[PDB]
Amino acid sequence: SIDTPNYDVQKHINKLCGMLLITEDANHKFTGLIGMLYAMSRLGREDTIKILRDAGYHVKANGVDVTTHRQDINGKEMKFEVLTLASLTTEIQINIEIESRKSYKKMLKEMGEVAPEYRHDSPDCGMIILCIAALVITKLAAGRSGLTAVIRRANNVLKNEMKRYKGLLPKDIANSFYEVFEKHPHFIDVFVHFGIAQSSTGGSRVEGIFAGLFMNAYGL
Numbered sequence: 001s002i003d004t005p006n007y008d009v010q011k012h013i014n015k016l017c018g019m020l021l022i023t024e025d026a027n028h029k030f031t032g033l034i035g036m037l038y039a040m041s042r043l044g045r046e047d048t049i050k051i052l053r054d055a056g057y058h059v060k061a062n063g064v065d066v067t068t069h070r071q072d073i074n075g076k077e078m079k080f081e082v083l084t085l086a087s088l089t090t091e092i093q094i095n096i097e098i099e100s101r102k103s104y105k106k107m108l109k110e111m112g113e114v115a116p117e118y119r120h121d122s123p124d125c126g127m128i129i130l131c132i133a134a135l136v137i138t139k140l141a142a143g144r145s146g147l148t149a150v151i152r153r154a155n156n157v158l159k160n161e162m163k164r165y166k167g168l169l170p171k172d173i174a175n176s177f178y179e180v181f182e183k184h185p186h187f188i189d190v191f192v193h194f195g196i197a198q199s200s201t202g203g204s205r206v207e208g209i210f211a212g213l214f215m216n217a218y219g220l
């Protein structure tokens with residue numbers, strides 16, 4: 001059973017990535033999977049199922065829809081927009097939203113209203129996460145843990161993005177991607193097809209950073 005998000009949930013998944021990026025001392029246990037969900041929503045359900053079947057994997061496709069979940073937090077009833085995911089519980093998704101909301105209030109208290117590029121809903125949050133995946137892919141292709149080189153290459157290449165996001169923690173995010181590619185090798189095929197299609201055309205500064213990072217996995 002594999003979740004195959006379609007184009008319709010791409011904005012939702014990007015916001016989930018953004019929620020983690022604004023979280024102070026964020027738990028990046030699910031970032032590898034969330035990043036892979038974003039790549040699949042960019043490829044679309046049809047292309048994702050095609051990649052897996054062609055790569056030889058058997059796939060029981062799970063439809064991904066947005067649902068409103070009612071949950072009691074601090075005595076008060078709250079409405080959360082969550083995705084129907086077999087790989088990520090409603091509880092985990094809601095806790096990511098709760099923790100990010102705590103960080104966001106701290107930000108308001110520190111600088112007043114937050115600029116677009118510093119928010120959880122900035123359009124490049126998913127791509128920022130996928131830039132770490134591009135660094136991990138290089139070290140899995142070049143030979144069994146080039147983790148120190150990933151962190152150091154990340155602090156240079158993603159210096160502007162680290163300044164924008166407190167939860168952009170290269171060590172934790174790289175560990176999460178290493179873990180998902182080891183545990184679910186079918187995600188390597190999905191990421192490689194995503195990277196080939198993306199490096200054809202953007203776009204934004206982050207889309208440009210990603211294409212250069214991805215292209216490096218082959219040449220100079």
Ligand SMILES: O=C(O)c1cc(C(=O)O)n(Cc2ccccc2Cl)n1
Nearest residue numbers: 019022097099100101102104105120
């Ligand atoms: O004015 C806004 O756009 C606004 C308000 C809030 C908030 O009250 O947390 N936030 C942060 C936010 C909103 C929804 C889901 C997660 C978060 Cl962190 N943005």
